[PDB]
Amino acid sequence: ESSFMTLFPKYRESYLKTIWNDVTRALDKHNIACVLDLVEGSMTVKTTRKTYDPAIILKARDLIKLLARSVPFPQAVKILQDDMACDVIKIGNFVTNKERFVKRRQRLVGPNGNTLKALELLTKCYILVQGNTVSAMGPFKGLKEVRRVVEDCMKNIHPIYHIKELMIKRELAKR
Amino acid sequence: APESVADFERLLIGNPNSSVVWMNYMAFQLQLSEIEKARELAERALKTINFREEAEKLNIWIAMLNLENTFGTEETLEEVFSRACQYMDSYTIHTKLLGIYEISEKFDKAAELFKATAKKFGGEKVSIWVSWGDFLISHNEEQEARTILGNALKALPKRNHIEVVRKFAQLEFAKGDPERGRSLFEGLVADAPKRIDLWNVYVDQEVKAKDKKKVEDLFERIITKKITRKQAKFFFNKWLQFEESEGDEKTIEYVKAKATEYVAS
Amino acid sequence: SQVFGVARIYASFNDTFVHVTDLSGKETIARVTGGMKVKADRDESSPYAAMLAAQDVAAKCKEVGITAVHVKIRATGGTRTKTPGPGGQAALRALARSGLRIGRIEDVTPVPSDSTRK
Amino acid sequence: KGISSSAIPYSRNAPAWFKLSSESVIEQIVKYARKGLTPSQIGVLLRDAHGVTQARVITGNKIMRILKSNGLAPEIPEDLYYLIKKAVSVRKHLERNRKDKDAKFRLILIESRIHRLARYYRTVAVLPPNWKYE
RNA sequence: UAGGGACGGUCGGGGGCAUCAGUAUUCAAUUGUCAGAGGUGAAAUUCUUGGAUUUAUUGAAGACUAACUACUGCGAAAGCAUUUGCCAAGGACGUUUUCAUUAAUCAAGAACGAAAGUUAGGGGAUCGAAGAUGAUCAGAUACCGUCGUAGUCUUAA
């Protein structure tokens, strides 16, 4: 028997109410139950008696906290297969002043989103720079690459250096 | 002189901020068996001194602290340090408390003051490391002194730890172990391999502790080492002065010979 | 009727550890860290290495007598990745598949609590 | 900066509920002032307890003039006095923890605000020259 | 519905000192177990049968204040997030309190600090901390006076 729970902000309930039946169909195929509470604003997920995969409660936990941290349902469901995981990079504790912090964070996003979209294409990940953290879904090599590019982007070196060396390493691993 | 509760108050009309004269009047009252009027004078000295002149208030605090360490109480010395903290920076006030404890010859209170320094100011800078080295050197344990200095140098930055090691080596040449001083000198010359600021420090410390065959030979190696003409001639002239102070004319000539060998390339 | 060990599995990047102590944790039983079952020096964090390590861990747990295991899954934590690697799911899947009963999933990765990077 | 002050009424008259005497106000004022109380505190206590609106309306003239005509004058005006004591309080606090630069900056502000109304009072010659901020 | 000052209940991650707590990290001690464990796209330097890595119990160190944390707050700006206490301070509001033009803007000068020294070749003319030399004081490496090393000068990181 196992049970996890996240609690989600109030503005998400009209979206989670919509996609909740699809959540129930994507977890009942793994034989694991889940409720969402609209009066306390939470999503809990419980291992039932018919559950024979014990690791799936961890991925269901990651799923409901991704639905908390605002990643779309068809983007979020890919946790349920094995070669996919979350990472939550922490960026707030690198530089002191607000001006340089938001300029390096906007540098991590990119002009028109080009840096972030090219990083998603290279690392095969789903990346959300949000607030003072950076969430990411992907394979584990992609998580390792996105952690090094974000933690080196909070230091002074421009992330398009890492996009360039990722293209170099892809076409240099293709031999 | 002004040495009472009436004559000092009458004669202090010309200079009310008289820190040394107020300290002497308070010590004269305490020798005159008036501790109450002595402490009243020691507390009103900083009040009769100016407000912006912090050094006079620190001097009145040190005077009340010395009177409390001589014929007063440790609570009055702590008030004197809180008073020192009410007259100046807290780390300097606690260092004045450590000095009053060293004057009162309390070894446990001196070690507690050096530890309270080596935590806060030991993580801040190297003055607490110097204080811990002073306390353990007066306690005659150079191993524990070097251990506390290395611990405080690890707690603080390491960019001044080279000058801290040179100061530890000079203190060990002064009143410690000469082999330990030469070992710390070699470690400092290793940490500053590009700078001969540790080489001249080692040579000056050995020549000060009368290690002539050490100082002149190491300075001759430094003068014939990878140095310029001025950097070679200064070290070779210092080594020749040390060798002539020892009585070595041919070695003083060979120092200049190595200088002429290294300056011409 | 069941007697419980505790799994203490550690799914870092670059390795996976399966280290099933007794219920206190003072006395360890059957550590078979991943990078020893099969090593190409890359596959040490792989699900195949994790399930090999979990299967002979469960073999030695069955020969000692432990039939069920409270499982504690730990990522590399600290000021680092904080998410479990590829082997944390595969280790406890193989421990459940190889006859050993599973209880009490919990994450004991070291959330660093206002850590040290400046 | 904000609009936070008092709104004096249109009436310059007695409030017509104020049955109390127009001289016992002055006796109460000099009672508080020679038990040693500053004129702003005189006015606010006379407002609050022995309730007058303000004593320039009910008495003849304002209360610093009442104290000066009753022989009860201040050595130094009230604003300058409170700024002097705030400056010396923060100076004693500064000669204490010598690392409160912030208090050093606001001591610069308090002394620069001493000198403004000090030279105002010199040009009006309320308190005389040869007064040079101790 | 210019300005200043007092009062009142306050407000704030504004400041200074002291105190308290937190879990990481690093190191050490004690076990349990055995052969590998870091790290990488792979590897390697490194750590290792006086037992590493992991696990449990502690202890010490220096930091730092996870989430909560916001187009929110405070500060003149740089900036400021643990508790508690002290020291002063500041702002908005309330005011039928007080003074009565006490006012606005910026040429010199300063405290602040975001505000710096990552590794190497080279010239040292001057200066020069570090080190040492004579008197002041129960106690004086500062004071006064000099010899003297890096550095102060330059170039890339």
Coordinates of C-alpha atoms (C1' of nucleotides) in Angstrom, one line a residue, chain E:
Chain E
rU1 C1' -4.2 68.9 -0.7
rA2 C1' 4.3 74.3 0.9
rG3 C1' 7.9 72.7 4.6
rG4 C1' 9.6 71.0 9.7
rG5 C1' 8.7 68.8 14.5
rA6 C1' 5.9 66.1 18.4
rC7 C1' 2.3 62.1 19.6
rG8 C1' -0.5 57.4 18.7
rG9 C1' -1.3 52.3 16.9
rU10 C1' 1.8 50.3 13.8
rC11 C1' 4.6 48.4 9.1
rG12 C1' 9.2 46.2 6.6
rG13 C1' 13.6 39.8 4.0
rG14 C1' 16.1 48.6 6.1
rG15 C1' 20.8 48.5 9.4
rG16 C1' 24.3 47.1 13.8
rC17 C1' 25.5 43.6 17.8
rA18 C1' 24.3 39.2 20.4
rU19 C1' 21.7 34.6 20.4
rC20 C1' 19.2 30.2 18.3
rA21 C1' 17.9 26.6 14.7
rG22 C1' 18.2 23.8 10.1
rU23 C1' 19.8 20.1 6.7
rA24 C1' 23.4 19.5 3.1
rU25 C1' 28.8 19.4 2.0
rU26 C1' 33.8 18.2 3.8
rC27 C1' 36.8 15.8 7.3
rA28 C1' 37.5 12.4 11.5
rA29 C1' 36.1 8.3 14.9
rU30 C1' 33.2 3.7 15.5
rU31 C1' 30.8 -0.6 13.4
rG32 C1' 28.4 -4.0 9.2
rU33 C1' 29.9 -5.9 4.3
rC34 C1' 33.2 -6.8 0.2
rA35 C1' 35.9 -5.1 -4.8
rG36 C1' 35.4 -2.2 -7.1
rA37 C1' 33.8 3.5 -6.9
rG38 C1' 34.3 8.6 -9.1
rG39 C1' 33.8 11.0 -13.6
rU40 C1' 32.7 11.0 -18.9
rG41 C1' 29.7 11.1 -25.2
rA42 C1' 33.5 7.7 -24.3
rA43 C1' 37.9 7.5 -21.1
rA44 C1' 41.8 9.2 -17.9
rU45 C1' 44.2 11.8 -13.3
rU46 C1' 42.3 10.5 -8.6
rC47 C1' 40.1 6.9 -4.2
rU48 C1' 41.0 1.5 -3.1
rU49 C1' 41.5 -5.7 0.8
rG50 C1' 45.8 -0.4 7.8
rG51 C1' 38.5 -1.9 3.5
rA52 C1' 37.2 2.5 -0.8
rU53 C1' 31.9 3.3 -2.4
rU54 C1' 27.2 2.3 0.4
rU55 C1' 24.7 1.8 5.3
rA56 C1' 24.1 3.2 10.7
rU57 C1' 25.7 6.1 15.2
rU58 C1' 28.1 10.4 16.4
rG59 C1' 31.6 14.7 16.6
rA60 C1' 34.1 19.0 14.3
rA61 C1' 34.6 22.7 10.6
rG62 C1' 33.4 26.7 7.4
rA63 C1' 29.6 28.4 4.7
rC64 C1' 24.4 29.0 3.6
rU65 C1' 19.3 30.3 4.9
rA66 C1' 15.9 24.8 0.2
rA67 C1' 10.5 25.0 -0.7
rC68 C1' 7.1 29.0 1.2
rU69 C1' 9.4 33.2 -2.8
rA70 C1' 5.2 36.7 -5.7
rC71 C1' 5.9 41.5 -12.3
rU72 C1' 5.2 41.2 -3.7
rG73 C1' 7.9 44.2 0.7
rC74 C1' 11.9 47.3 2.6
rG75 C1' 16.4 50.5 1.6
rA76 C1' 19.3 56.9 -1.1
rA77 C1' 21.6 53.3 -4.5
rA78 C1' 24.8 49.1 -4.4
rG79 C1' 21.3 45.7 -2.1
rC80 C1' 18.5 42.9 1.9
rA81 C1' 15.2 36.2 3.2
rU82 C1' 16.3 31.0 10.1
rU83 C1' 14.5 32.3 15.5
rU84 C1' 14.8 35.4 19.7
rG85 C1' 16.5 39.8 22.3
rC86 C1' 18.8 44.6 22.5
rC87 C1' 20.4 49.3 20.1
rA88 C1' 19.0 53.3 17.6
rA89 C1' 16.5 54.6 12.8
rG90 C1' 13.0 55.1 8.6
rG91 C1' 8.2 55.3 5.9
rA92 C1' 2.8 55.5 5.1
rC93 C1' -1.6 56.6 7.8
rG94 C1' -4.5 59.0 12.0
rU95 C1' -4.4 64.1 14.3
rU96 C1' -9.9 70.2 16.0
rU97 C1' -1.0 68.9 18.5
rU98 C1' 3.2 72.5 17.6
rC99 C1' 6.6 76.3 14.7
rA100 C1' 5.4 79.9 11.0
rU101 C1' 8.3 80.4 5.3
rU102 C1' 11.5 77.8 8.2
rA103 C1' 11.4 76.3 0.8
rA104 C1' 13.0 73.6 -4.9
rU105 C1' 17.1 72.4 -8.2
rC106 C1' 21.9 71.2 -9.2
rA107 C1' 29.3 73.1 -10.3
rA108 C1' 34.0 71.1 -5.4
rG109 C1' 34.2 67.2 -1.3
rA110 C1' 32.5 61.7 1.0
rA111 C1' 30.6 57.4 3.3
rC112 C1' 29.2 53.3 0.2
rG113 C1' 30.4 49.1 -2.0
rA114 C1' 27.6 45.3 -7.6
rA115 C1' 32.7 47.0 -8.1
rA116 C1' 37.8 43.6 -9.4
rG117 C1' 42.7 40.6 -9.5
rU118 C1' 41.8 33.4 -12.3
rU119 C1' 47.6 31.5 -14.4
rA120 C1' 52.0 32.4 -17.0
rG121 C1' 56.5 35.2 -19.8
rG122 C1' 59.2 39.9 -19.0
rG123 C1' 61.6 45.0 -17.3
rG124 C1' 62.5 46.6 -11.6
rA125 C1' 64.0 53.2 -12.1
rU126 C1' 61.2 54.7 -7.6
rC127 C1' 58.2 53.1 -3.6
rG128 C1' 57.6 48.9 -0.7
rA129 C1' 53.9 45.7 3.2
rA130 C1' 56.7 40.5 5.0
rG131 C1' 61.6 40.5 8.0
rA132 C1' 65.2 43.2 10.9
rU133 C1' 67.7 47.8 13.4
rG134 C1' 67.8 52.8 18.4
rA135 C1' 64.9 55.7 22.6
rU136 C1' 59.0 56.7 24.6
rC137 C1' 55.7 53.6 28.2
rA138 C1' 54.5 47.8 34.2
rG139 C1' 53.9 46.6 28.5
rA140 C1' 55.0 49.5 22.0
rU141 C1' 57.3 44.7 15.2
rA142 C1' 53.0 51.0 15.0
rC143 C1' 55.0 56.6 16.4
rC144 C1' 60.2 58.7 14.5
rG145 C1' 64.5 56.9 11.2
rU146 C1' 66.5 53.3 7.3
rC147 C1' 68.2 48.4 4.5
rG148 C1' 65.1 45.5 2.0
rU149 C1' 61.3 40.9 -1.3
rA150 C1' 56.9 40.3 -4.2
rG151 C1' 54.0 44.0 -5.8
rU152 C1' 53.6 49.0 -7.8
rC153 C1' 55.0 48.4 -14.7
rU154 C1' 53.6 45.4 -19.0
rU155 C1' 51.2 41.2 -21.9
rA156 C1' 47.5 36.9 -22.9
rA157 C1' 44.0 33.7 -19.3

